[PDB]
XYZ file of C-alpha atoms in Angstrom:
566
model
C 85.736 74.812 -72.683
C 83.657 75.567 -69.992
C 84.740 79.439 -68.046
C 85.771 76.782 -65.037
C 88.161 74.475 -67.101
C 89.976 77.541 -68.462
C 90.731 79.210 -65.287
C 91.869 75.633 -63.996
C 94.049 75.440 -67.448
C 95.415 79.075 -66.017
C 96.976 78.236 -62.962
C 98.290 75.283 -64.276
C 99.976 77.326 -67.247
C 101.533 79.279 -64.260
C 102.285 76.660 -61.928
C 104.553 75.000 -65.196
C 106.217 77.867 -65.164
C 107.524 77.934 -61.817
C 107.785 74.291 -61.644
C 109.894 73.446 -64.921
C 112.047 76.673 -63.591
C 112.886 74.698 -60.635
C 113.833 71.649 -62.690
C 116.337 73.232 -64.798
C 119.605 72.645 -64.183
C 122.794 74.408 -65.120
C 124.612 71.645 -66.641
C 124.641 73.177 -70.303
C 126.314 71.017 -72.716
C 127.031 71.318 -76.514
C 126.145 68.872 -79.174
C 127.346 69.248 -83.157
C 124.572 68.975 -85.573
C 124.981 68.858 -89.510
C 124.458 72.582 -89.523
C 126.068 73.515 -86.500
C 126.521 73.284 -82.899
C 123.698 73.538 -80.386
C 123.495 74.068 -76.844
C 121.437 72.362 -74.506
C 120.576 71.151 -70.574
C 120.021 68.973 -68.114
C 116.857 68.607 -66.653
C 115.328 67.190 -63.928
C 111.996 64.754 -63.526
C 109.431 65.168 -60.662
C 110.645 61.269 -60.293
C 113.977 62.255 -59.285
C 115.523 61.669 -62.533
C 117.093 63.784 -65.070
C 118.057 63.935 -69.205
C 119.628 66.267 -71.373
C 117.031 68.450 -73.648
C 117.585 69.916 -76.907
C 114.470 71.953 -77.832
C 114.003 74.041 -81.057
C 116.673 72.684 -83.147
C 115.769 73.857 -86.606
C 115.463 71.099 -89.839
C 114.218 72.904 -92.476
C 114.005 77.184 -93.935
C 111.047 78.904 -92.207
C 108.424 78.350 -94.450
C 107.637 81.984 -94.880
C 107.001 84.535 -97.769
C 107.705 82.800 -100.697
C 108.216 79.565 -99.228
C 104.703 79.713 -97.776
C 102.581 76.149 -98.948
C 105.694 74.770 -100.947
C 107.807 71.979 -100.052
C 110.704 72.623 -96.958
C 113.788 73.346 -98.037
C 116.987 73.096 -95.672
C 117.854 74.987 -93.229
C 120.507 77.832 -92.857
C 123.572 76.238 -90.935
C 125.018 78.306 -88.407
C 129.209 78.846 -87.169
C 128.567 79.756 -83.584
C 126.174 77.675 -80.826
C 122.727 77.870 -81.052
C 120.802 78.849 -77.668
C 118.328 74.916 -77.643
C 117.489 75.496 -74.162
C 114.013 77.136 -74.548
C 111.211 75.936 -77.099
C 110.182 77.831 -80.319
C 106.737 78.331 -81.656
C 104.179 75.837 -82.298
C 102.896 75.661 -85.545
C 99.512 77.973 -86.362
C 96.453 76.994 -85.025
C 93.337 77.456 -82.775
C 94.262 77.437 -79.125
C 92.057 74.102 -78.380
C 91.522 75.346 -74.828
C 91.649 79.077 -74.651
C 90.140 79.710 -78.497
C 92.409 81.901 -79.559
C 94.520 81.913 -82.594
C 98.034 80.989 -81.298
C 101.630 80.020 -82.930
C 103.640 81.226 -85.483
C 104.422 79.624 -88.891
C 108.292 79.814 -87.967
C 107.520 75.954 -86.244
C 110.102 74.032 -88.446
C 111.571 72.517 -85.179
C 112.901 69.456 -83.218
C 113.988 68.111 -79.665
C 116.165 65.383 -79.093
C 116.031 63.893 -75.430
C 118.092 61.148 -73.556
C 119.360 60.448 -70.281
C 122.956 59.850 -71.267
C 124.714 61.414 -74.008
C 127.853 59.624 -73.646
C 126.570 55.432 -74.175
C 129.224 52.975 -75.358
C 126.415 51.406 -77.186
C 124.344 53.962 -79.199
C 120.829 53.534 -77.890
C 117.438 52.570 -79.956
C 115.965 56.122 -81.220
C 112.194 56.774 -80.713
C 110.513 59.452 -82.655
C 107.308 60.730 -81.734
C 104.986 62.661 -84.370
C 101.996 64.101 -82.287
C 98.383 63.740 -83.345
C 95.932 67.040 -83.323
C 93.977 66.293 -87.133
C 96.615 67.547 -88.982
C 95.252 70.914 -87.154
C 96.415 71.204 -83.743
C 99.546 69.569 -81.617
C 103.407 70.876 -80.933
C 106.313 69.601 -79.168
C 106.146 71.427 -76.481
C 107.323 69.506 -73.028
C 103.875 70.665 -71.228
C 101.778 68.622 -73.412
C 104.706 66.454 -74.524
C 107.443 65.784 -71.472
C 109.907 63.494 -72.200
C 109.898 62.687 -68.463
C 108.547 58.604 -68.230
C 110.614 57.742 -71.303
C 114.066 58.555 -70.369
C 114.000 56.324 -67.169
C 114.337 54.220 -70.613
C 118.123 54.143 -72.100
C 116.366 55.628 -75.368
C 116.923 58.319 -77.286
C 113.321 60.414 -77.713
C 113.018 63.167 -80.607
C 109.855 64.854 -80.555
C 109.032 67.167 -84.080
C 107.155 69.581 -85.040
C 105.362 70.071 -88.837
C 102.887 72.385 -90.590
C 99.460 72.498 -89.502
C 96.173 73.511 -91.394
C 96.079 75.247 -94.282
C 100.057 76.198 -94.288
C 100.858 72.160 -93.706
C 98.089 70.720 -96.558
C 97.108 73.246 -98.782
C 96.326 71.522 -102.379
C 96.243 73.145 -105.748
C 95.941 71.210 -109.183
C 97.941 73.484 -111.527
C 101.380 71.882 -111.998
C 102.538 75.564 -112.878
C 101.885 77.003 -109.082
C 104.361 73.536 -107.199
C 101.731 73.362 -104.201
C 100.740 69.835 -104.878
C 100.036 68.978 -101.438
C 101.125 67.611 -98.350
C 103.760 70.240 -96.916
C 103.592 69.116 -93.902
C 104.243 65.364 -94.661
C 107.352 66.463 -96.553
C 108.432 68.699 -93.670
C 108.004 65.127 -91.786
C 110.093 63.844 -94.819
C 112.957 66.262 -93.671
C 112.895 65.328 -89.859
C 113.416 61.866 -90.609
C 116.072 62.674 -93.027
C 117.509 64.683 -90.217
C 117.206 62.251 -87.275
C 118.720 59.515 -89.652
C 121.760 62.050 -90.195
C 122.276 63.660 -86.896
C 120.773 61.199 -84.001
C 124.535 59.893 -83.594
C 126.041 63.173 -82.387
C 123.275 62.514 -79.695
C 123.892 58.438 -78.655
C 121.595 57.277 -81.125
C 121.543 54.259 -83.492
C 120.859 55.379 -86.714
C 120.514 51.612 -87.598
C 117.523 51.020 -84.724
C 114.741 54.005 -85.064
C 111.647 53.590 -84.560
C 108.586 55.990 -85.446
C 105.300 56.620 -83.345
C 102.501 58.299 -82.869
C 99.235 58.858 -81.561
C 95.462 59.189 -84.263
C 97.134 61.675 -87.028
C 100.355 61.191 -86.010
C 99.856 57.080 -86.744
C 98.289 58.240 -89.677
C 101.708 60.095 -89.812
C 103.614 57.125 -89.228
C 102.141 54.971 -91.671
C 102.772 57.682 -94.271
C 106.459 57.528 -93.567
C 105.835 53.592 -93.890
C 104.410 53.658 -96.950
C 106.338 56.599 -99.146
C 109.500 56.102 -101.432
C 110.631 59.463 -99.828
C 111.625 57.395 -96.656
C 112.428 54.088 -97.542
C 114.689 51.979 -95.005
C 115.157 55.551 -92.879
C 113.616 53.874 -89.659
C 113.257 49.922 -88.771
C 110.291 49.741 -86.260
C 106.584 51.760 -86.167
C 103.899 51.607 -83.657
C 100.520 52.839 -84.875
C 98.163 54.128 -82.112
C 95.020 54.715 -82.437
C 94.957 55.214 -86.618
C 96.476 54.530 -89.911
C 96.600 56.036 -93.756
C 93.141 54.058 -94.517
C 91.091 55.917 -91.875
C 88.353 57.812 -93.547
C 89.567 61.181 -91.793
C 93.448 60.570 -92.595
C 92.926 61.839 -96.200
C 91.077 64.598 -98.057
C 90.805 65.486 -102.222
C 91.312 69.422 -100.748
C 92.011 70.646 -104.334
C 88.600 72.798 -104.448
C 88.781 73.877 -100.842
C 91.594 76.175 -101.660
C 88.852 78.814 -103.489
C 86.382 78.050 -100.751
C 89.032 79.297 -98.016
C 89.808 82.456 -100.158
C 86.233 83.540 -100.966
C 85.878 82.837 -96.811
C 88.723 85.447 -96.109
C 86.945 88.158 -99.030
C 88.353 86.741 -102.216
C 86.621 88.024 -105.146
C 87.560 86.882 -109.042
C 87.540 83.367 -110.424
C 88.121 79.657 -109.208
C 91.467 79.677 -110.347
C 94.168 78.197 -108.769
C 96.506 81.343 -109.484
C 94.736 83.994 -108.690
C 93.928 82.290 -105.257
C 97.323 81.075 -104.737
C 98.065 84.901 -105.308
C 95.462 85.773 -102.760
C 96.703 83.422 -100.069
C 100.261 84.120 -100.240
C 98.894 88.009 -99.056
C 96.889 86.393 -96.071
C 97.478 87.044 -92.372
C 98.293 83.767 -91.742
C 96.209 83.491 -88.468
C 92.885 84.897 -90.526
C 93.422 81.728 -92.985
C 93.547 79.108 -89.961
C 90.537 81.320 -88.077
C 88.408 80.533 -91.012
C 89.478 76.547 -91.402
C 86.308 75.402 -89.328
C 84.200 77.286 -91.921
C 84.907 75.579 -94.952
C 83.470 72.178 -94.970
C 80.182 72.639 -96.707
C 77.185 70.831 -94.431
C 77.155 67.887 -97.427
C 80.950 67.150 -96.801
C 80.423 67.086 -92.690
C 77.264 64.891 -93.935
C 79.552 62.388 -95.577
C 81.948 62.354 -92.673
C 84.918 64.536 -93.888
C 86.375 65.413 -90.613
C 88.875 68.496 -91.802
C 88.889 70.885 -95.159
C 92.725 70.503 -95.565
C 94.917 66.958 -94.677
C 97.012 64.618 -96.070
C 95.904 63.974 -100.104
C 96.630 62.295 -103.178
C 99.078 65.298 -105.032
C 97.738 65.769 -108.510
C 100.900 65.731 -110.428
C 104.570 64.399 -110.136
C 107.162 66.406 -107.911
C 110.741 65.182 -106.619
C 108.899 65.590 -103.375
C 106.043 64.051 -103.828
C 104.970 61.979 -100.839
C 101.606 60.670 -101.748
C 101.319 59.874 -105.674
C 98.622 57.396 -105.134
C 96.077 56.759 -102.493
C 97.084 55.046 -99.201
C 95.578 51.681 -100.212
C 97.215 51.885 -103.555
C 100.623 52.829 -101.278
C 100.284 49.470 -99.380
C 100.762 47.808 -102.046
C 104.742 48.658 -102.695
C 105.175 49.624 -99.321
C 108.569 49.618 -97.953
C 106.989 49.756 -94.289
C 105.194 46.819 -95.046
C 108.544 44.894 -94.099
C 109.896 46.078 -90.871
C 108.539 45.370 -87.531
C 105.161 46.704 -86.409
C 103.108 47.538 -83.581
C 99.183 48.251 -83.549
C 96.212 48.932 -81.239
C 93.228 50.857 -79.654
C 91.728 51.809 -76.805
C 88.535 49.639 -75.556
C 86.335 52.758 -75.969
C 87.650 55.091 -78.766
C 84.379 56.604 -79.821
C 83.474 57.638 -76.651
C 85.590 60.907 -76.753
C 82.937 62.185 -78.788
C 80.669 62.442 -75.637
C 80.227 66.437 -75.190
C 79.828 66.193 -78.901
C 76.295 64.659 -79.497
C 75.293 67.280 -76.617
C 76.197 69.807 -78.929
C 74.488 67.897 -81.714
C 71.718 65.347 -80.235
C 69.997 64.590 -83.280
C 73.534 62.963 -84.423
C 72.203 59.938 -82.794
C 69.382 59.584 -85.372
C 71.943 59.112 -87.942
C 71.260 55.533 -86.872
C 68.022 55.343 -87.856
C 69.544 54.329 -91.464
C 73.049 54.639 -90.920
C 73.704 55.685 -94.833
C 76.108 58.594 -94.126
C 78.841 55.530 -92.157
C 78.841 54.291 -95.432
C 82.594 53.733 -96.588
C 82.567 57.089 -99.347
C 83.930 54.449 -102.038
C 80.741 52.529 -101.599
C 78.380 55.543 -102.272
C 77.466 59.119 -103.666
C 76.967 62.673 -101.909
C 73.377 63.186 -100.877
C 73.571 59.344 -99.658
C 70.116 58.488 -101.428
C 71.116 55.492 -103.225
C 68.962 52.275 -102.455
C 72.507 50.507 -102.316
C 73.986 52.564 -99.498
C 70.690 51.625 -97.730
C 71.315 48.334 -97.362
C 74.446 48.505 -96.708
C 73.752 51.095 -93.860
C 70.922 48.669 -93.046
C 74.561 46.246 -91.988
C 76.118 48.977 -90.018
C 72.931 49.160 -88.098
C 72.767 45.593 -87.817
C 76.114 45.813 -85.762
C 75.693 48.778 -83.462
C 72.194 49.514 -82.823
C 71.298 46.829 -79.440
C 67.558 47.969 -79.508
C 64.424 49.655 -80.941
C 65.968 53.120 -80.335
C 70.013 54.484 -81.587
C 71.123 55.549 -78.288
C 74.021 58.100 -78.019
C 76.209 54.592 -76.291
C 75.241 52.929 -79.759
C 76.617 56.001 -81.877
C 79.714 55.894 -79.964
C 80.737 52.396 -80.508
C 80.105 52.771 -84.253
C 82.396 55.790 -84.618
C 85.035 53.562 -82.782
C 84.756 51.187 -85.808
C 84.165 53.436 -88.437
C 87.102 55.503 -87.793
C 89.539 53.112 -85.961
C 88.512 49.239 -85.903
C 87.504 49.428 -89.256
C 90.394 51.025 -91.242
C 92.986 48.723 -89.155
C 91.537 45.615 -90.363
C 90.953 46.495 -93.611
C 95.506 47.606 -93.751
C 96.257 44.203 -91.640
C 94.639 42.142 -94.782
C 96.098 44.401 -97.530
C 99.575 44.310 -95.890
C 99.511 40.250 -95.398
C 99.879 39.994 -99.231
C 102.946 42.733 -99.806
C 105.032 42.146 -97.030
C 108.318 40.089 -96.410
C 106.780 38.665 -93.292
C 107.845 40.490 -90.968
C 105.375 40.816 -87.444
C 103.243 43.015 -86.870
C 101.879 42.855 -82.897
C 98.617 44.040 -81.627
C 97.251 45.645 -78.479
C 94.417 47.003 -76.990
C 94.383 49.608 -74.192
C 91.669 49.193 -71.522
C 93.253 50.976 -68.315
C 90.961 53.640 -67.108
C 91.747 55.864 -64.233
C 91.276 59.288 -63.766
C 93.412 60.564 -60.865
C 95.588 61.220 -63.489
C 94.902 62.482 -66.750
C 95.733 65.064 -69.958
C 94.803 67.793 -71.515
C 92.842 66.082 -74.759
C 90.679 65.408 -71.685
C 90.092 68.985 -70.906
C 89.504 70.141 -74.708
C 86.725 67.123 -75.008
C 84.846 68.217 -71.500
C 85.794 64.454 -71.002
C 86.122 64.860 -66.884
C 84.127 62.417 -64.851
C 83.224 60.071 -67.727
C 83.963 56.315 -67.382
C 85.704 53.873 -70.034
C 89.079 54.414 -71.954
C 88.813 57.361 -74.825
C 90.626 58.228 -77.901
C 94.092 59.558 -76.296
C 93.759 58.192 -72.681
C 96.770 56.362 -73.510
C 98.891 59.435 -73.967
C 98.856 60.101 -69.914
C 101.119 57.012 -69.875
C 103.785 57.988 -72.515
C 104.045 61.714 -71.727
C 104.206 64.490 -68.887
C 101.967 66.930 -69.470
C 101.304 70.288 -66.983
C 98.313 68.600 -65.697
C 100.272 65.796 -64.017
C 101.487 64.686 -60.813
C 103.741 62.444 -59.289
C 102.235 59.257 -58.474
C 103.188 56.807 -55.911
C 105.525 53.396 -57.154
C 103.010 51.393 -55.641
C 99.543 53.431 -57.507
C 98.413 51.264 -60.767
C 98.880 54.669 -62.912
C 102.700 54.178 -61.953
C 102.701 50.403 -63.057
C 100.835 51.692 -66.414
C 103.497 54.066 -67.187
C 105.972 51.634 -66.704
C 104.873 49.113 -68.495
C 103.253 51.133 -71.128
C 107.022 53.369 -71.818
C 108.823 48.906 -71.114
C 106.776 48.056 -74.262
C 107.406 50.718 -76.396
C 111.105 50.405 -75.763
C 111.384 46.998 -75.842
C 109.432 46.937 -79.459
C 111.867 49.385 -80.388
C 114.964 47.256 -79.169
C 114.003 44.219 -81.068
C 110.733 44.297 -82.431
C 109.627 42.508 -80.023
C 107.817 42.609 -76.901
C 108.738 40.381 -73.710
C 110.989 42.148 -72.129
C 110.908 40.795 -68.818
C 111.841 43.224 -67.434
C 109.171 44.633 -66.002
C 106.218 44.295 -63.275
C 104.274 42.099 -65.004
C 105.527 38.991 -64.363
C 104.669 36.619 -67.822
C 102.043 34.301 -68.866
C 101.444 36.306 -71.439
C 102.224 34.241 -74.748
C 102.319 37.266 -77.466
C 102.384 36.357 -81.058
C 101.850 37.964 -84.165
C 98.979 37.847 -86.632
C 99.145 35.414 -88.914
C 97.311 35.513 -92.784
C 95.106 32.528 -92.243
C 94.081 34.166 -88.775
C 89.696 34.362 -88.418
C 90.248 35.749 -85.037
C 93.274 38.581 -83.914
C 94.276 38.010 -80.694
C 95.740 41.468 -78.613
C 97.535 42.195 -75.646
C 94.959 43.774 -73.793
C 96.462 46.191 -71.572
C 94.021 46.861 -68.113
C 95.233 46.238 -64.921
C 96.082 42.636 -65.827
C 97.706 42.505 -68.747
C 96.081 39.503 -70.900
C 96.031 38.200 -74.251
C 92.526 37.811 -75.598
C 90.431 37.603 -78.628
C 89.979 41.197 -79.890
C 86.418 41.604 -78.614
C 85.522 43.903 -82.048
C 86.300 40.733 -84.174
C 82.516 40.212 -84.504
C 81.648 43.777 -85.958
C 84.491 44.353 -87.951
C 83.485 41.311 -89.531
C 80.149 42.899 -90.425
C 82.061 45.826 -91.675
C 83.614 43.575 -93.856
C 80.629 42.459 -95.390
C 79.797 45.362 -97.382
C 82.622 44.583 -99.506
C 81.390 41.591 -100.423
C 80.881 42.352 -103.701
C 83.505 44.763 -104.271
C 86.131 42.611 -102.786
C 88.801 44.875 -104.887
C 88.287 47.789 -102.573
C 88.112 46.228 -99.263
């Protein structure tokens, strides 16, 4: 980020301090958990509104020492009242503005939000799991302010979960019980929680619904399709990604070595001896090294991150992922409970700054082998059948003579959004009770008010609605301000936290209540659909063909003769 956008991040770091200072309150109360008491506070909004906040409430052991890369285990209850009214670490990771090695792996933590903790009527529960690659994110309020949603009667719970390394680790031997996905399971644990506990805060432990935003839909769907957490939650909205995305899951097994010969590992690839060398680690000197391990053939064939969610090599109690996410969808218990999907209009074109730091990334188009779906092809991406089949890809992006960087941009929106949706809608029409699944498509672009995934992507000043634009209209974040009623980033927020809520009342959206009055006709998708229609979310909000249909359609066509994978 450049020298300017840090000093800018700065005083905004200091002007949340002495601005969430002012909107504390000193109305503590005290709410009883399963493992003890904990003590909260009011809050107020910049909008003039207030909730009570519980931050740092702990569901699981800190995963340290021993307990480092294995499953969570419960947490320690407590016989006194535990201090909630500050927030604990986030979990370890690069600082994706300042660059430096930040958090703590004691990040095991929760925060429950509403605006009323005494309701006659329990109130539908909303749980947000935060995106960041499975490598960055937290709960914390100044990226994550619970602010627009509890002018909602809602409950809000946003969690926390191992990053990196400590959250996805991988090792083959059933001896060493780190078969994967720690971080899922610690997931596992704050849904087992919220189901448990959200009543002591005017929850409905019969009306949850789970969201959340690129790896935390990814996250969602997970918690759709394992055993683990069957019937815990009744309602999921998946923004922006999915379990099928190319980058939502990695075969890590080997990467385990390659992280331990990057830290000075010498001996053998043997899952023992660098499980023994791991557990020893600083644990910020293992996530320091995490953007060195992805050989230049793996970054080739699109693997976005060394460690993430994977298929766990051998049985556990705990296991989360026993087969891969396709496979999942099949027996899914998520596949029957209400559901919410969509994208932005322009999802690729966060990658902007990106081809500036690589260029000659746009003459990947040239033969587009290395978009390929990995099933459909080898390593060094040589084959003569992934050329034709990149020859289709090309077909559907490439407008003219030349790949421009515009042309890249719309592919990656397919290849790592459009694409993967599609390909779960069809595979979940034929294991599914019926239940609806609803789809939108965000197209509102304004930039007098913003956040902070702007800032990490040098993203300022750059037309068209990115991956995460959305988020501005869920959350408060430090770099916000209030906005006027009448402003059409007021409406958004409104009507963006109305849908949410109203999906998660019913599993539905109309809920007239709103400004927005209502032509809109939205129905699901049905199976013998050619054509999805979407809510497309701008300043009007209008139903409409989904204006991908066309490429994902080409997409499709590489299947042809594999229709088994598709």
């Amino acid at each position: 980020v450049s020298l300017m956008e840090k000093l800018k991040w700065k005083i905004k770091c200091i002007e949340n301090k002495f601005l969430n200072y002012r909107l504390t309150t000193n109305e503590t109360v005290v709410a009883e958990t399963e493992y003890g008491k904990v003590k909260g506070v009011k809050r107020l909004t910049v909008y003039d509104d207030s909730y009570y906040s519980f931050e740092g409430i702990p569901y699981a052991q800190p995963p340290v020492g021993e307990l480092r890369f294995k499953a969570p285990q419960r947490p320690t209850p407590w016989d006194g009242v535990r201090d909630c009214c500050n927030h604990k670490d986030k979990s370890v990771q690069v600082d994706f503005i300042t660059g430096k090695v930040c958090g703590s792996e004691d990040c095991l933590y929760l925060s429950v939000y509403t605006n009323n903790l005494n309701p006659e009527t329990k109130r539908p529960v909303l749980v947000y799991i935060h995106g960041g690659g499975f490598i960055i994110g937290e709960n914390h309020r100044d990226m994550y302010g619970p602010d627009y949603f509890i002018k909602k009667d809602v409950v809000l719970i946003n969690i926390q979960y191992r990053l990196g390394a400590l959250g996805f680790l991988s090792l083959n031997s059933e001896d060493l019980n780190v078969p994967g996905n720690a971080g899922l399971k610690d997931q596992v644990m704050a849904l087992r929680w919220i189901k448990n506990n959200c009543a002591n805060f005017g929850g409905n432990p019969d009306n949850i619904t789970v969201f959340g935003e690129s790896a935390g839909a990814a996250s969602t769907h997970y918690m759709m399709l394992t055993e683990q957490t069957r019937g815990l939650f009744h309602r999921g909205i998946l923004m922006s990604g999915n379990a099928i995305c190319p980058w939502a899951n990695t075969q890590c097994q080997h990467r385990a070595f390659t992280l331990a010969k990057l830290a000075g590992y010498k001996g053998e690839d043997n899952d023992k001896d660098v499980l023994e060398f791991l557990m020893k680690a600083k644990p910020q000197d293992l996530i320091k090294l995490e953007e060195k391990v992805l050989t230049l053939e793996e970054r080739t064939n699109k693997v976005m991150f060394p460690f993430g969610p994977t298929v766990e090599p051998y049985q556990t109690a705990d296991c989360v992922l026993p087969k891969h996410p396709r496979e999942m969808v099949k027996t899914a218990w998520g596949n029957s409970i209400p559901t919410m999907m969509g994208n932005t209009s322009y999802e690729g074109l966060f990658f902007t700054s990106i081809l500036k730091q690589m260029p000659l990334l746009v003459k990947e188009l040239e033969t587009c082998v290395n978009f390929v779906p990995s099933e459909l092809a080898d390593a060094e991406r040589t084959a003569p059948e992934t050329l034709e089949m990149g020859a289709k890809i090309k077909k559907a992006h490439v407008t003219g003579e030349t790949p421009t960087a515009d042309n890249f941009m719309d592919l990656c929106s397919h290849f790592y959004f459009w694409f993967p949706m599609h390909r779960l809608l069809q595979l979940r029409f034929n294991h599914t009770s019926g239940t609806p699944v609803y789809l939108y498509r965000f197209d509102f672009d304004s930039e007098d008010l913003i956040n902070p995934y702007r800032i990490m992507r040098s993203g300022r000043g750059v037309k068209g609605v990115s991956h995460t634009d959305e988020l501005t209209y869920f959350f408060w974040n430090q770099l916000a301000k209030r906005m006027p009623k009448e402003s059409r980033e007021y409406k958004t927020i409104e009507r963006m936290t109305g849908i949410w809520t109203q999906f998660a009342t019913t599993g539905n959206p109309y809920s007239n209540e709103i400004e927005g009055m209502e032509n809109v006709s939205w129905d699901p998708i049905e199976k013998s659909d050619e054509v999805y229609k979407c809510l497309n979310i701008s300043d009007e909000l209008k139903m409409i063909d989904v204006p991908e249909m066309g490429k994902i359609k080409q997409w499709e066509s590489m299947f042809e003769k594999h229709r088994d994978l598709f």
